[PDB]
Amino acid sequence: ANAGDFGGYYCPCHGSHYDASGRIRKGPAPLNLEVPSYEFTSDDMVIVG
Amino acid sequence: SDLELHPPSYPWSHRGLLSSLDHTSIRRGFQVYKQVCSSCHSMDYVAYRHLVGVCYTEDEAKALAEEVEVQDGPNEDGEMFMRPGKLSDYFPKPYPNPEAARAANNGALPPDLSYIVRARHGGEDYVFSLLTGYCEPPTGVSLREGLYFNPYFPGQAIGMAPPIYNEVLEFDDGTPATMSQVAKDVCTFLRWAAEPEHDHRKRMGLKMLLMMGLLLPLVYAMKRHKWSVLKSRKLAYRPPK
Amino acid sequence: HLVGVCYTEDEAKALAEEVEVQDGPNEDGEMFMRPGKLSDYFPKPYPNPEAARAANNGALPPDLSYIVRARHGGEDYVFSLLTGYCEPPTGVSLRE
Amino acid sequence: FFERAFDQGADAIYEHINEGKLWKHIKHKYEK
Amino acid sequence: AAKNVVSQFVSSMSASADVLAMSKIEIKLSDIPEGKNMAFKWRGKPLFV
Amino acid sequence: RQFGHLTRVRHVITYSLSPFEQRAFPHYFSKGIPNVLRRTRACILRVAPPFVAFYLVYTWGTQEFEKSKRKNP
Amino acid sequence: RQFGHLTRVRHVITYSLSPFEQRAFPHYFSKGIPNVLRRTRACILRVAPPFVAFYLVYTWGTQEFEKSKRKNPA
Amino acid sequence: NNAFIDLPAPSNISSWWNFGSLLGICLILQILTGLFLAMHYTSDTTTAFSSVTHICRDVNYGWIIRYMHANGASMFFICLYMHVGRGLYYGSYTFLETWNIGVILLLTVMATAFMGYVLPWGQMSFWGATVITNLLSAIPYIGTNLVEWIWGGFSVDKATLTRFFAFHFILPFIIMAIAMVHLLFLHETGSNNPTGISSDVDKIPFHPYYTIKDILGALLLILALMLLVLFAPDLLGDPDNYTPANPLNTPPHIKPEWYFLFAYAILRSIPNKLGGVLALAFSILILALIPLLHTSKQRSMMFRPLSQCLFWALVADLLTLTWIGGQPVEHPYITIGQLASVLYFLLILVLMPTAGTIENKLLKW
Amino acid sequence: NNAFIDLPAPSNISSWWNFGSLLGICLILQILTGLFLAMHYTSDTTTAFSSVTHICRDVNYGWIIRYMHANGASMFFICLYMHVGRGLYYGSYTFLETWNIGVILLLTVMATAFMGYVLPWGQMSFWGATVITNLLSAIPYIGTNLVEWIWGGFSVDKATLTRFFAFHFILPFIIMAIAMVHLLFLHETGSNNPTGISSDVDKIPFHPYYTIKDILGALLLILALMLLVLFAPDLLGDPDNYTPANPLNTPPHIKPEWYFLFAYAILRSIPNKLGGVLALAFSILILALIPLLHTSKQRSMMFRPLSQCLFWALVADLLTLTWIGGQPVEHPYITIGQLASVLYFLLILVLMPTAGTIENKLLKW
Numbered sequence A: 001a002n003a004g005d006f007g008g009y010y011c012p013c014h015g016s017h018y019d020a021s022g023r024i025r026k027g028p029a030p031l032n033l034e035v036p037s038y039e040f041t042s043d044d045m046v047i048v049g
Numbered sequence B: 001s002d003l004e005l006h007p008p009s010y011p012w013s014h015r016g017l018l019s020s021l022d023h024t025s026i027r028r029g030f031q032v033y034k035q036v037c038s039s040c041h042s043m044d045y046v047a048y049r050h051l052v053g054v055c056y057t058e059d060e061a062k063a064l065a066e067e068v069e070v071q072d073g074p075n076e077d078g079e080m081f082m083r084p085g086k087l088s089d090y091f092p093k094p095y096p097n098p099e100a101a102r103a104a105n106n107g108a109l110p111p112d113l114s115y116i117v118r119a120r121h122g123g124e125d126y127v128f129s130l131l132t133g134y135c136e137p138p139t140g141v142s143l144r145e146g147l148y149f150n151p152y153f154p155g156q157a158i159g160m161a162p163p164i165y166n167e168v169l170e171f172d173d174g175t176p177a178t179m180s181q182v183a184k185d186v187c188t189f190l191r192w193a194a195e196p197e198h199d200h201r202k203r204m205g206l207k208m209l210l211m212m213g214l215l216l217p218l219v220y221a222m223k224r225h226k227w228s229v230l231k232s233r234k235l236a237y238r239p240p241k
Numbered sequence C: 001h002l003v004g005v006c007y008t009e010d011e012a013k014a015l016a017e018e019v020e021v022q023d024g025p026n027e028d029g030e031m032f033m034r035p036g037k038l039s040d041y042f043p044k045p046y047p048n049p050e051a052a053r054a055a056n057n058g059a060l061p062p063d064l065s066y067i068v069r070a071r072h073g074g075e076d077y078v079f080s081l082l083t084g085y086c087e088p089p090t091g092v093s094l095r096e
Numbered sequence D: 001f002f003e004r005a006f007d008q009g010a011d012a013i014y015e016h017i018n019e020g021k022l023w024k025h026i027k028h029k030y031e032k
Numbered sequence E: 001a002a003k004n005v006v007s008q009f010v011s012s013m014s015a016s017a018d019v020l021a022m023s024k025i026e027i028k029l030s031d032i033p034e035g036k037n038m039a040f041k042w043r044g045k046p047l048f049v
Numbered sequence F: 001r002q003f004g005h006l007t008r009v010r011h012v013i014t015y016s017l018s019p020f021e022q023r024a025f026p027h028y029f030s031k032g033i034p035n036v037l038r039r040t041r042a043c044i045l046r047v048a049p050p051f052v053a054f055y056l057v058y059t060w061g062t063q064e065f066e067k068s069k070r071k072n073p
Numbered sequence G: 001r002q003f004g005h006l007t008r009v010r011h012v013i014t015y016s017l018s019p020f021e022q023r024a025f026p027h028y029f030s031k032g033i034p035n036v037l038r039r040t041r042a043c044i045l046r047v048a049p050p051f052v053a054f055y056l057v058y059t060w061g062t063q064e065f066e067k068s069k070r071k072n073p074a
Numbered sequence H, I: 001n002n003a004f005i006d007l008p009a010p011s012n013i014s015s016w017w018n019f020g021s022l023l024g025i026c027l028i029l030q031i032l033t034g035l036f037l038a039m040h041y042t043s044d045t046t047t048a049f050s051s052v053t054h055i056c057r058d059v060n061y062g063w064i065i066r067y068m069h070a071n072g073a074s075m076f077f078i079c080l081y082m083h084v085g086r087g088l089y090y091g092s093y094t095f096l097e098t099w100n101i102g103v104i105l106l107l108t109v110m111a112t113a114f115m116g117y118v119l120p121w122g123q124m125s126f127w128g129a130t131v132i133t134n135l136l137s138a139i140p141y142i143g144t145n146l147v148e149w150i151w152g153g154f155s156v157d158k159a160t161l162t163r164f165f166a167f168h169f170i171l172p173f174i175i176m177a178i179a180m181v182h183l184l185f186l187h188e189t190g191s192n193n194p195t196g197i198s199s200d201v202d203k204i205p206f207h208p209y210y211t212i213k214d215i216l217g218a219l220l221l222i223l224a225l226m227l228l229v230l231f232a233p234d235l236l237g238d239p240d241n242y243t244p245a246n247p248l249n250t251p252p253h254i255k256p257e258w259y260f261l262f263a264y265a266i267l268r269s270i271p272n273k274l275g276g277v278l279a280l281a282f283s284i285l286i287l288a289l290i291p292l293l294h295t296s297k298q299r300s301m302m303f304r305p306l307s308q309c310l311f312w313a314l315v316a317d318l319l320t321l322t323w324i325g326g327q328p329v330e331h332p333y334i335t336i337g338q339l340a341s342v343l344y345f346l347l348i349l350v351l352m353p354t355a356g357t358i359e360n361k362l363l364k365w
């Protein structure tokens, strides 16, 4: 997180740069980082899965 | 004493080679373990998820798991905490360790029941006979405090007091909870617990038998076919004279 | 492990007895405390990494058993790090 | 007509021999 | 027979029943300050919030 | 070991039929059973006795063990 | 493959001495060094150049990397 | 091909000659199921038993692979004993090299099965590992040192289980190599046959005659294995190994795997430590002496009625020993076991060689 | 033996022909130290790393066995690359069967070393296992399914480590068998020699000439291995594997074992997933193509000056790729790595075959 040329993320294994949306912008990765199913709760929290 | 009393053979509905377990009986048996045996015996290798599709729906098993509280963590503060159980949790252990188990049972150790039916000669015939076999000591026999007379237990002196009796629990389907009924059901549940692959191996067994019934005679015919050349050959010795 | 390396067996036994380590369960099924002994491993300051971070503003002090092999520079790095703290340069602002 | 027929026929025989004992047979009593 | 036996062994290498026991995860949003990417272990994989 | 270099054989004639020209189970029972009986009678005197002995020692020994543990044998 | 069945050779004479009749290191240096120099000078033009190239690319690339990270007054 | 196809084979070998291939199949079966079990098994004493229950409860078809491995071991021994019996009866042991490698194979499989039984770390596992390794303590002056060296400590513990997993893993492959040598030596002579008479004048191609018989045999072996696995998986096992190892308590009716019972009875028959261990070792190694004890002018027992009776007496005696090995050390079993043990050695060392000489005189040679 | 003693050998092979035996020695050394390590190693993710520290700290001489195994793996690759290099330069690849088996051996050793590196469960272990297995996810449609099948779950976890121990244990023995086939094929032709000209007119007995040279080589190999083990055991290793695996964090400067660096650089040079994986695979599999790319009328490069220059350019290029594989993905390394990658394939597929044709014309044939 916070590494790379787009303030998002930088993968050290082979140079993949993602933005703060998790979208791939540079490097060898083919897809944007995955988004799982989730819902926010009545206790301010979030339930993923 | 060194005398031995072997259990008789009960006609379990799952005794036959192609006979499956009675799942309603497994369901009732689970209730017996949950309400009665679990207070002293662990069942370390069975989890709530294992009950799904066997004797309870997924929703029912989830509800059963939520009935207990299990430790989890550590949390962000490095603390362990309690939470409602869930399908992935294994049945709760009544004691943290065998030492405590013995301390709570006059020195005797209630064994884990996950494999009890496979870990004892006689299997459910032994467990059923044991559960329904308590009686008063024969004349001349005096047991030390904490021990009960059971003709089916090796040595005849067991550290477990009769765990079941009429109405020890109420079944979810109304089945009269007589001692023998309760024993019959918990033994069936214990069979499933020790051998969950039980029904499937027998189904596969039937298919194996049907396939061998086909292939063996055919391959044998192939054998006889090839060998017929040798089996009917004739020899003649014609030395010059 | 200290015996015959930098302390005699008696000295190491004494060093071990300086700490109280958990053991058991006993005949009542209870865990208990006892003086440490040669076979015990050095006491852990925290029961788990979560607690370690909680006690160090979120930072996790790593186990030092292999620190010198787990870092490029080995002892040169550890020595430089330990004796290298200084005030931040101009323009650098560090969080609490 | 082997694996399909063979498997279905054998499963049928198995279930018949064990009518009312299998989970698939009592499932309806507890079950959208 | 052979197809059945081979697929059973191959099947044994697939995720065992305990691995498929999954479950969702509840996260406390307040514990995560603005600007912070927090990694959580959800199914042996990192989960970024 | 290879066909062609096994041993020396002279003056032997062998006649054979294709497997397709004959039965795979000729007289399977009308002859099979009688030969099985012959082969059985032919060995039983050599094979059976020792096992009959085992059987006896087993039953005697087992019963002896039982009686020995009782109050009144 | 076995001696006696390898190939056909005619009219060749070979003379040899027992190892006990000779030196194991005859002229080891007075000849060894000169031959090593011959063999070295004989291959260096084929072997060395590519590595000299590697060396250059390495030093240039490394120094270039360093320079590139130094503050570029903006 | 030079292991199949045009290999010349006797025209008259019977089904007793099928066990060699069944042994090869058992070995491949064990290696395959074994490798798949090793993909899930962990050898730490704290997790061994649990990892096995995990295989049987949660790994897809883990239960069938596990029980096929367990019962496969039993089928392996049934085949081994039939194979050795065939050799003794027909005088196949005169192929000295093939036979002696054969003895090595028997000993290696026993060692392999022993170590495998230790892996699940049940009560039988722990005490079997204790007793069998201690056999070495019978060796003068260095016995005890050898045992502790093997254990990796002063008792069976963690270090023991981990090295046993490693030994059990590799030994089967060594067995496979040794088996191939067993076959290379056999090919130099070709197979023996029921009459014991050279069959060079009547050989037939291995294929199709014995390739088809071997397949039929393979099918029957598989039928027997799966009848056990699918209808009676625990029939040949011990209930006590379903209980985790407890180093402070040896089960009161502890007994060896069924295929080791005869040897156990022999050892138990001798009220002397060194004597029992020597008798145990000799009960197997005597196989290497059989060729030297052959007195008959004929190779096979087919034409030797007296030898036949003694042979079956030896089989009945091994059955007797197997039965005794499964009973408590009490009267009258103690005496029967001692008589059976003595008869075993008396039959092999004295009675059979003597009968051979008697038969020779009766035929005037 | 006919594997030694009277085996005819060329009179003129140089030390570059010593690597075959050194490889056999590396394999035996890895098998021996490996078996001894397996006697103490446990594959449970909770105990793997600890069991390795236990080996190095409390097992008698456990540390020397452990580091001999680690550095032995490195010596194995140094020898492999020298062996292959010799083959390419001297045209030994024209022994097609021997060469192709050789390619299989290279691939199997790589796979074996990869899995071995995963066993201690350090950071490099966990991420190497993650990245390398995921190479399969590049396979259209079923890639992801294959990866999860290999892992035994949705991520690298307990099931993965346990099966990797099993695979790592057995593969080396398979390698030994394949190596013996490698040699059986070579014996059919006998060895090539520096001139590339048939040496049937001047063969000498393997013993004593090459048996003594092989021993001298073995001594030098052992010297090199022990200099590493006793004076610089971590020199060729990565400090990051001294840190337990952390599935939530990939070290910022993570990099492959040194012998995989050139291949890593090639894969990293392609900003496309499938393209990089294909280039990776081809970087090794191209060896099987070399025989088909041979254009010269002469077998060896000994008498081919242009081919020699290109050969050394290829070596310098692999050295270049190795260096780049060890640097961050930043300018100017990204471009140098891409040029180096292109040159690698350009040299093998175009430049060398072309030079062979040019040399042919210069000699008028």
Ligand code: HEC
Residues within 6 Å of the ligand: B032, B033, B036, B037, B038, B039, B040, B041, B105, B108, B109, B110, B111, B116, B120, B127, B130, B153, B157, B158, B159, B160, B161, B163, B164, B186
């Ligand atoms: C605590 C009050 C108990 C309850 C409730 C039940 N059991 Fe128990 N059991 C208990 C002890 C202390 C022991 C040890 C006995 C000894 O002397 O060793 C046992 C033992 C058993 C056994 C094992 C018998 C054997 O062969 O070793 C079985 C099969 C058994 N118990 C079954 C069982 C079942 C099914 C129960 C619920 C119906 C049950 N027990 C309850 C203590 C207690």
Ligand code: HEM
Residues within 6 Å of the ligand: H016, H017, H018, H019, H020, H021, H023, H024, H027, H080, H083, H084, H087, H090, H092, H093, H095, H098, H099, H101, H102, H103, H105, H106, H109, H175, H179, H182, H183, H186, H190, H191, H192, H193, H287
């Ligand atoms: C892993 C175990 C073993 C394997 C795989 C094996 C395999 C074989 C095979 C394939 C044959 C040929 C077919 C046959 O005649 O059965 C054979 C023959 C033979 N084996 Fe074994 N064997 C094994 C163990 C042994 C043992 C324990 C002995 C004896 C102590 C032995 C003694 C012999 C002999 C003497 C023959 C020749 C039989 C004859 O032709 O009459 N074998 N074996």
Ligand code: HEM
Residues within 6 Å of the ligand: H027, H030, H031, H032, H033, H034, H035, H037, H038, H041, H052, H066, H069, H070, H073, H076, H109, H112, H113, H114, H115, H116, H117, H118, H119, H120, H168, H169, H170, H172, H173, H175
């Ligand atoms: C000659 C071949 C073999 C024999 C006779 C043999 C025998 C056995 C026996 C008797 C057991 C105990 C079974 C039980 O009751 O649980 C066992 C366990 C085991 N074997 Fe083998 N085995 C063989 C080959 C192999 C091979 C090749 C491997 C691994 C590459 C292997 C892996 C295992 C494993 C992991 C266990 C423990 C799990 C279990 O108990 O089922 N075995 N083996």
Ligand code: HEM
Residues within 6 Å of the ligand: I016, I017, I018, I019, I020, I021, I023, I024, I027, I080, I083, I084, I087, I090, I092, I093, I095, I098, I099, I101, I102, I103, I105, I106, I109, I175, I179, I182, I183, I186, I190, I191, I192, I193, I287
């Ligand atoms: C476990 C790995 C390997 C072992 C044990 C091994 C062993 C051997 C041995 C003993 C020789 C004879 C001595 C020598 O010339 O060095 C040989 C020759 C050879 N090997 Fe390998 N080798 C291995 C891998 C490979 C690889 C990776 C290749 C190539 C892709 C290969 C290609 C060859 C060829 C072509 C020859 C003939 C050399 C000549 O006579 O010019 N080998 N190998």
Ligand code: HEM
Residues within 6 Å of the ligand: I027, I030, I031, I032, I033, I034, I035, I037, I038, I041, I052, I066, I069, I070, I073, I076, I109, I112, I113, I114, I115, I116, I117, I118, I119, I120, I168, I169, I172, I173, I175
């Ligand atoms: C072609 C042969 C082999 C190669 C190239 C090889 C390579 C490796 C590598 C690279 C490691 C990691 C070393 C480290 O940094 O810790 C490793 C670990 C290991 N290997 Fe091997 N290995 C070979 C054969 C074997 C064999 C035959 C066994 C077992 C019978 C074995 C058992 C082990 C064990 C237990 C470990 C983990 C302990 C450790 O990390 O040192 N290896 N191997």
Ligand SMILES: C/C=C(C)/C=C/C=C/[C@H](OC)[C@@H](C)[C@@H](OC)[C@@H](C)CCc1oc2c(O)c(OC)cc(OC)c2c(=O)c1C
Residues within 6 Å of the ligand: H107, H108, H110, H111, H114, H124, H125, H127, H128, H129, H131, H132, H133, H150, H254, H255, H256, H257, H260, H263, H264, H267, H280, H281, H284
């Ligand atoms: C590191 C490797 C080592 C040390 C391997 C050594 C193997 C030795 C032999 O194989 C070659 C050995 C297995 C073989 O002896 C010929 C068997 C017939 C031994 C039979 C045997 O089994 C027992 C057994 O299984 C038990 O289980 C619960 C318990 C036992 O008594 C309490 C015995 C026992 O009293 C005997 C004699």
Ligand SMILES: C/C=C(C)/C=C/C=C/[C@H](OC)[C@@H](C)[C@@H](OC)[C@@H](C)CCc1oc2c(O)c(OC)cc(OC)c2c(=O)c1C
Residues within 6 Å of the ligand: A013, A014, I107, I108, I110, I111, I114, I124, I125, I127, I128, I129, I131, I132, I133, I150, I254, I255, I256, I257, I260, I263, I264, I267, I280, I281, I284
């Ligand atoms: C179940 C068994 C399986 C799946 C085996 C498959 C084996 C595949 C190949 O061997 C045949 C493979 C090892 C071989 O490819 C030709 C190597 C050169 C791959 C080189 C390689 O290494 C890396 C590595 O080591 C790392 O460590 C920390 C990290 C890495 O990136 C972050 C890499 C990497 O990016 C590459 C390309």
Ligand SMILES: CCCCCCO[C@@H]1O[C@H](CO)[C@@H](O)[C@H](O)[C@H]1O
Residues within 6 Å of the ligand: B134, B135, B136, B137, B143, B144, B145, B146, B147, B148, B149, B150
């Ligand atoms: C089967 C019935 C046999 C009678 C044996 C019971 O014995 C009794 O068990 C009690 C357990 O709480 C002890 O407290 C008491 O002292 C003891 O005498």
Ligand SMILES: CCCCCCO[C@@H]1O[C@H](CO)[C@@H](O)[C@H](O)[C@H]1O
Residues within 6 Å of the ligand: H235, H236, H237, H238, H258
């Ligand atoms: C194929 C016929 C084998 C003989 C059947 C009996 O088998 C025996 O059964 C006993 C009780 O179940 C077991 O304790 C014993 O280990 C087993 O060998």
Ligand SMILES: CCCCCCO[C@@H]1O[C@H](CO)[C@@H](O)[C@H](O)[C@H]1O
Residues within 6 Å of the ligand: F057, H331, H332, H335, H336, H339
């Ligand atoms: C196969 C022959 C059966 C063995 C008969 C054993 O017989 C027993 O021998 C004991 C020896 O002390 C006697 O004390 C005992 O009274 C006697 O019945």
Ligand SMILES: CCCCCCO[C@@H]1O[C@H](CO)[C@@H](O)[C@H](O)[C@H]1O
Residues within 6 Å of the ligand: C072, I235, I236, I237, I238, I239, I257, I258
């Ligand atoms: C024979 C001398 C070879 C050069 C030794 C360098 O070796 C390298 O050092 C790096 C850190 O400096 C490590 O990260 C890397 O894994 C290691 O292979």
Ligand code: FES
Residues within 6 Å of the ligand: A011, A012, A013, A014, A015, A016, A027, A028, A029, I131
């Ligand atoms: S795994 Fe992220 S760049 Fe390759």
